[PDB]
């Protein structure tokens with residue numbers, strides 16, 4: 378179990394790449410009340426660069442916003 | 444694995460270029476997540492290495508897995 | 512001073528390679544190696560990250576030569592050795608870094624203990640983070656002249672924090688001492704910080720907190736003491752936190768709570784007491800009562816009963832998380848004054864019956880979770896005053912689908928079919944409750 382709901386999908390740089398995308402990006406993480414005070418847990422889409430360069434999604438991570 | 448000036452993470456990654464494709468690896472594995480002290484006893488928050496598949500595996504993320 | 516033009520002028524030289532990665536710039540020293548001593552990441556005007564791979568302090572002699580980074584808000588140093596008996600400001604000076612307001616130093620390869628000198632010249636800093644997995648010693652003079660600090664974070668296996676470390680920290684608003692080994696609060700520390708609002712003391716060893724441990728902390732709004740191995744707490748432990756708004760008492764070892772624990776704390780807005788590591792059978796009388804600002808209550812677990820007095824005259828309560836406890840029933844007057852309640856979670860609790868007057872005044876309730884319990888029935892007209900109801904969870908309950916017992920519920924669920932999340936089913940047969948038709 379992960380804090381952010383994600384989906385595995387294929388992306389196509391213009392060969393295919395299997396990636397992890399947020400089901401709910403910029404939305405709160407699950408277990409949002411389980412974090413220390415003054416941290417706002419938000420699901421964030423992260424990216425990786427491959428080189429023509431391509432911004433390709435990597436994973437959905439729970440970011441603790443201050 | 445630098446991050447934004449107003450954000451913290453449960454798991455920290457180290458960025459590296461391999462030959463160019465950017466990889467994100469766990470700062471050692473398999474370590475407990477940070478800011479994970481208020482989860483139920485049954486859960487073991489552990490930092491887990493994520494991979495993206497190319498049409499081979501590429502380490503692309505370090506994520507917190509609440510292991511039961 | 513650094514940008515698109517500065518990135519191009521490097522590259523081909525063969526000293527340090529600058530490659531643009533999205534909005535940032537990656538600099539590897541020495542150029543082309545799977546063991547670089549310095550891996551820099553820069554996003555102009557915003558931040559710079561220095562990642563060292565050092566064997567000794569003499570390896571700083573192979574830092575990128577010249578380089579003009581200029582105006583930057585944040586400075587992050589990962590895995591770097593403290594530079595002997597020289598300031599950190601000198602490394603920053605050599606890379607041409609001006610006006611940094613945030614300094615983060617994270618390393619398990621310190622080589623020595625941190626000193627007042629390591630922080631020379633950068634006394635105008637507003638944010639400081641020092642993090643290590645090493646057993647360290649923090650000197651009382653470390654933060655001398657840090658009169659501009661607003662946020663302090665120290666995570667270095669600290670057992671005792673020196674009292675004189677908090678002098679000249681007159682503008683501090685935030686403290687993050689999570690994951691240390693603090694056994695006791697440093698004395699008279701809050702008289703020195705009149706602008707302190709956040710106080711994070713989670714994952715420490717503060718087993719014995721008393722009234723005197725927070726003397727002078729009258730401006731504090733949030734106290735997070737979760738995971739501190741606390742078994743007991745005196746009734747006056749928070750008497751001095753007169754402005755406190757959020758209290759986190761989670762992941763502790765309470766078998767009970769004293770009666771007037773939140774007296775003098777009349778500006779409370781949220782209280783968390785989640786994942787208690789031992790059963791906490793009940794709460795004392797009027798624990799969360801006569802609170803004019805209290806809105807959110809997160810309570811878990813092994814709670815077996817609640818007093819009817821629990822939320823008396825706390826009319827502003829909007830969210831109550833009572834899920835995953837062991838409650839068999841609720842007192843009829845428990846939600847008598849919760850006129851502004853929006854959400855109530857009672858799922859996964861072992862509830863066998865509910866009083867008919869429980870939802871008599873919760874006319875603003877929109878979400879009600881009663882799933883995964885031991886309810887066979889609900890009394891007639893129990894949900895009739897829930898005018899604002901939008902969503903209800905009644906599934907995973909052993910509903911007795913006998914007539915006239917199931918009449919009100921099956922009829923109510925047909926009249927409010929859209930509001931039901933999941934499907935409440937009859938025990939044994941497995942037929943949906945709303946598909947049972949009682950006569951007349």
Ligand SMILES: *[C@@H]1O[C@H](CO)[C@@H](O[C@@H]2O[C@H](CO)[C@@H](O[C@@H]3O[C@H](CO[C@@H]4O[C@H](CO[C@@H]5O[C@H](CO)[C@@H](O)[C@H](O)[C@@H]5O)[C@@H](O)[C@H](O[C@H]5O[C@H](CO)[C@@H](O)[C@H](O)[C@@H]5O)[C@@H]4O)[C@@H](O)[C@H](O[C@H]4O[C@H](CO)[C@@H](O)[C@H](O)[C@@H]4O[C@H]4O[C@H](CO)[C@@H](O)[C@H](O)[C@@H]4O)[C@@H]3O)[C@H](O)[C@H]2NC(C)=O)[C@H](O)[C@H]1NC(C)=O
Pocket residue numbers: 401404807829830853854877878
């Ligand atoms: C305390 O507990 C309460 C529990 O209730 C918590 O508050 C809730 O928080 C939820 C967070 O998930 C909120 O849910 C969102 O609601 C969005 C709709 O807005 C709301 O609409 C209702 C409508 O009410 C009734 O509906 C009928 C029609 O059926 C209307 O005729 C009529 O209005 C009627 O009354 C309304 O009650 C809400 O009003 C409240 O909030 C507003 C502020 O917004 C405030 O001014 C007001 O006073 C009320 O307090 C509000 O208007 C809904 O759009 C969201 O879902 C969509 O987005 C998510 C992502 O965010 C997706 O994952 C979903 O799949 C949905 O996506 C669809 O829709 C979007 C937008 O149209 C599209 O872009 C997509 O393509 C897709 O089609 C979401 O469910 C909920 O509103 C809120 N409840 C209340 C009463 O406030 C509160 O968080 C708790 N606090 C704490 C600290 O825990």
Ligand SMILES: *[C@@H]1O[C@H](CO)[C@@H](O)[C@H](O)[C@H]1NC(C)=O
Pocket residue numbers: 545546547564
């Ligand atoms: C640091 O350098 C050494 C060189 O011996 C290498 O073994 C190690 O993997 C490097 N560490 C990182 C994180 O690059």
Ligand SMILES: *[C@@H]1O[C@H](CO)[C@@H](O)[C@H](O)[C@H]1NC(C)=O
Pocket residue numbers: 621622623624645646647648
């Ligand atoms: C800091 O000081 C303590 C006490 O003298 C010592 O045991 C520890 O090893 C020092 N830390 C480092 C990183 O050298």
Ligand SMILES: *[C@@H]1O[C@H](CO)[C@@H](O)[C@H](O)[C@H]1NC(C)=O
Pocket residue numbers: 705729730753754
């Ligand atoms: C809250 O703090 C301010 C000073 O920061 C003070 O003036 C005020 O009286 C305090 N409130 C209470 C209830 O003590």
Ligand SMILES: *[C@@H]1O[C@H](CO)[C@@H](O)[C@H](O)[C@H]1NC(C)=O
Pocket residue numbers: 850851874875898899
């Ligand atoms: C909701 O709360 C208000 C203010 O407390 C109250 O006056 C009213 O009775 C409630 N609203 C409804 C629709 O019952």
